[PDB]
Each structure stands twice: as C-alpha cells, then as structure tokens.
Amino acid sequence: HMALSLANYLAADSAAEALRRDVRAGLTATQKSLPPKWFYDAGSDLFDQITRLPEYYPTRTEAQILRTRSAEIISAAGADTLVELGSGTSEKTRMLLDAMRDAELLRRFIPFDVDAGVLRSAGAAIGAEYPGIEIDAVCGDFEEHLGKIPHVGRRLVVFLGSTIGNLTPAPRAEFLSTLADTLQPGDSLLLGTDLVKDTGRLVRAYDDAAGVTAAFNRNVLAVVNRELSADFDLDAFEHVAKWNSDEERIEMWLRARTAQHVRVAALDLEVDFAAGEEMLTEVSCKFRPENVVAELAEAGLRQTHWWTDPAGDFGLSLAVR
Ligand SMILES: O=C(O)[C@@H](Cl)Cc1cnc[nH]1
Ligand SMILES: [Mg+2]
Secondary structure, three states, X not given: OOOOEEEEOOOHHHHHHHHHHHHHHHHHOOOOEOOHHHHOXXXXXXXXXXXXXXXXXXXXXXXXXXXXXXXXXHHHHOOOEEEEEEOOOOHHHHHHHHHHHHOOOOOEEEEEEOOHHHHHHHHHHHHHHOOOOEEEEEEOOOOOOHHHOOOOOOEEEEEOOOHHHHOOHHHHHHHHHHHHOOOOOOOEEEEEEEEOOOHHHHHHHOOOOOOHHHHHHHHHHHHHHHHHOEOOOHHHEEEEEEEEOOOOEEEEEEEEXXXXXXXXXXXXXXXXXXXXXXXXXXXXXXXXXXXXXXXXHHOOOEEEEEEEOOOXXXXXXXXXX
C-alpha cells in the first residue's frame, strides 16, 4: 500500500523555467522546433492509446520479446534490483519483475521518472503485487540526475520503448556514456531499440488512420497555450510524419495550413508562421543491429545478448561494463 521511499530532485518552478527557455529558443529558431518532452502532460493519456494502435508496432513487438525471453534476460543479468528509466506502469515492467521473482532474485525496484505522482501510484501497485519488495523511487530527469539512482544491489537498468531514439546522435552518445559511468561491475543495461524496416510501415506507425498520433502532436500546442498564455489555433496545423533517409529517423512536424500569428504572452513574444511553414516536434531514430553494438561499445558497454522478434522489427540488447 503506502510503503515507499521517494527522492525528488525536480521542482515545479524549475520545470516552468525549462518550458519558458525551450519554447523561446524553439519558436525563434530559423527552423522552428519544440522538444518532445513537453508532449507528456496529463498527452501521456494519448501516448498510452498510441501503444495500442494497429499501426504502432513497437510496444507490442517489444512486449512479445520480453514475454518469450524474460527468463533468459533475468538469468543473464543475475540482478536482484530492477532500475527502470520509466514509471513502472507497464506490463513489460511486470514481465521482468515476475521473472526476477520466479528466479528468487528480486529484492528491489527503482523507478526513475519526472512525475512524482505517477511514481507514487506505480509504487503502490508494485508493492501490492510483490510483497516484501523494497521500492526506492527517484523523481529526476535522466539527463542530469542519473548519479542520484542508488547503487545498492546488483542492478539491471532498463530503458525500453526505443525512447533512446528521441535523442539525436550527440546527446545520445553523451547519455549512454554517462549512464555507463553510473554502473558498477556486475550491473547490466537492457536497452530497447526500434530497427530500420519498410519505410511505409515506419511512416504509418507515426501517422495512424484514426488520427490519434496527430492529436498527440498537436497537443504540444495546447500545452504552450495553457502554460505560457499563447493562442495557437490547433485546427490550423497539419500533422506530418516524415522518414528522413539520411539520418534514418522518423520525424514529426506541424505544418501551418495558412499564415498564423501567435502571441506567447507569458514570454512577451509574437511568433509568425508562413503558410506551409513546418515546425519539428519530434525525432525517432531507427537503428541497425550492427550499429547498436558500436554505440554501446563507444559508451564503454559490451553487448552480451541481443534479442529480436522473428521479423527483425525491434531489438533488445543486454550490455555490461
Ligand atoms: O518515438 C516513439 O515511437 C515514442 Cl518514444 C514516442 C512517439 C510515439 N508516437 C509518436 N511519438
Ligand atoms: Mg507583454
């Protein structure tokens, strides 16, 4: 029920300041952009729905790999502590915890994410399902507070969903290098990476028939409207998903149907969009198996295991110091 440890390194005023800075920088850039972290206001609900769309294969593909190989993953890791870069709300989390329990290894769960309220809820759910488990939640941002994750036990750190694909190569390398420097001998990283495949399937996964992804994308405008007193007309922006073959990444864009004039009153800022002008809201890099090995090695980690679905749509790596 209520048994919990929670460390909170984020402040409400500090997040508000981060949004101010990001929106000012992004809307005044020669090529306009907004960071996708701001998708996930209570947007989080829309993303949950996205994971169940027929076109969006990543979640169910990763889940099926875990469903059939979690015992092997847990045996390879030999960890008694599961660290999740994420909130611990998924079935995937339970697949891993179940296997750790079956192996009589499980002692501790450490969820790491940016919303304290969700960490509390997940902690209560996990606590009830795995009596005796120690839960140490950390509210922090995984590009700054990784050093705050406790080093107790032998740790399996998981970063699922190909969320690592939201980082472009330079910040991605810095992230993996930093994460690797918080690991001890005996610790393991379990990394989910979505893989290069048919480009039609890729684009459709980010431009579903039902329009749910379009709603998710346009909602970042609603976040700016509410939080920074802006007047984006959401109906005036078209959802566009692109495959960038040079960078091998999916991109989400918002395209102005007609010229728009947007005042972001909280920033004392007026922003103009030309008819047809596009603003970048997300990248989702896709990986080649051989390159995953290389990126891990450059970060100081040796890939010891690789799991992929029979179609080769998605990959999971286990890597060690
Ligand atoms: O890049 C993804 O696939 C996840 Cl992390 C976020 C997302 C899902 N649909 C649009 N963006
Ligand atoms: Mg003013």
